[PDB]
Amino acid sequence: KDTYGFSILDIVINNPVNLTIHFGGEKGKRIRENYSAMIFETIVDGKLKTEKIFKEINEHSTSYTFRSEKG
Amino acid sequence: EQGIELEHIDSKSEFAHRIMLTNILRMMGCVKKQKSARGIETRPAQVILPMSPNHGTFGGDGMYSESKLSLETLFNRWHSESWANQLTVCGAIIGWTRGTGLMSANNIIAEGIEKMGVRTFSQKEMAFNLLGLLTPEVVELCQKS
């Protein structure tokens, strides 16, 4: 809840098909940062090449939807 | 509320004040309660409040001025209470907008007012002004204060 803006309990109990995370307000910007700061840290030719998980999440994103067919 | 001075404030004005103030606070309150019941702390609703430069300047408008001035408390209440994550406050001080239910009775003089180097608005322009408050940059600004 505090880091990624979702309840793992909610997903276990309700198994929602989609989950939208909202990045509104101060708390939402902090959660958005956590999604952005979530990075792949690879070493290529003795150089740190940091890539982003959640490419579609930038500083102008207001939401992110996790998607599934069934849950 | 037209032709309702202080001494005429009665049923209609109390009802108008319920519409234009009290039940706006209740509507905001209801949205706050729904969001909080569902744990929504990161998707605040921007409240575009129809504020007025008319705080008893024209007269004869019942409790209009009281309704409009009372909305200005929300600017402070946003900081002092516990609803800031559910609602943001955007106070639009709406200028002289020709053609509306409230202002159509004042259309004939607007050319004269503009000779002072002042601006009256069409409903289209005012709508455009208010839609400017719902742009991503103003939305982010109201989330800060």
Curated annotation (Swiss-Prot), chain A:
Extra remark: Present with 91800 molecules/cell in log phase SD medium.
Function: Fatty acid synthetase catalyzes the formation of long-chain fatty acids from acetyl-CoA, malonyl-CoA and NADPH. The beta subunit contains domains for: [acyl-carrier-protein] acetyltransferase and malonyltransferase, S-acyl fatty acid synthase thioesterase, enoyl-[acyl-carrier-protein] reductase, and 3-hydroxypalmitoyl-[acyl-carrier-protein] dehydratase.
Protein name: Fatty acid synthase subunit beta
Family: Belongs to the fungal fatty acid synthetase subunit beta family.
Disulfide bond annotation, renumbered to this chain: none
Subunit structure: [Alpha(6)beta(6)] hexamers of two multifunctional subunits (alpha and beta).
Curated annotation (Swiss-Prot), chain B:
Cysteine pairings via disulfide bonds: none
PTM remark: 4'-phosphopantetheine is transferred from CoA to a specific serine of the Acyl carrier domain by the C-terminal PPT domain. This modification is essential for activity because fatty acids are bound in thioester linkage to the sulfhydryl of the prosthetic group.
Subunit structure: [Alpha(6)beta(6)] hexamers of two multifunctional subunits (alpha and beta).
Family that this chain belongs to: Belongs to the thiolase-like superfamily. Fungal fatty acid synthetase subunit alpha family.
Note: Present with 17000 molecules/cell in log phase SD medium.
Protein's job: Fatty acid synthetase catalyzes the formation of long-chain fatty acids from acetyl-CoA, malonyl-CoA and NADPH. The alpha subunit contains domains for: acyl carrier protein, 3-oxoacyl-[acyl-carrier-protein] reductase, and 3-oxoacyl-[acyl-carrier-protein] synthase. This subunit coordinates the binding of the six beta subunits to the enzyme complex.
Name of the protein this chain belongs to: Fatty acid synthase subunit alpha
Full-protein positions shown: 776 to 920 of 1887
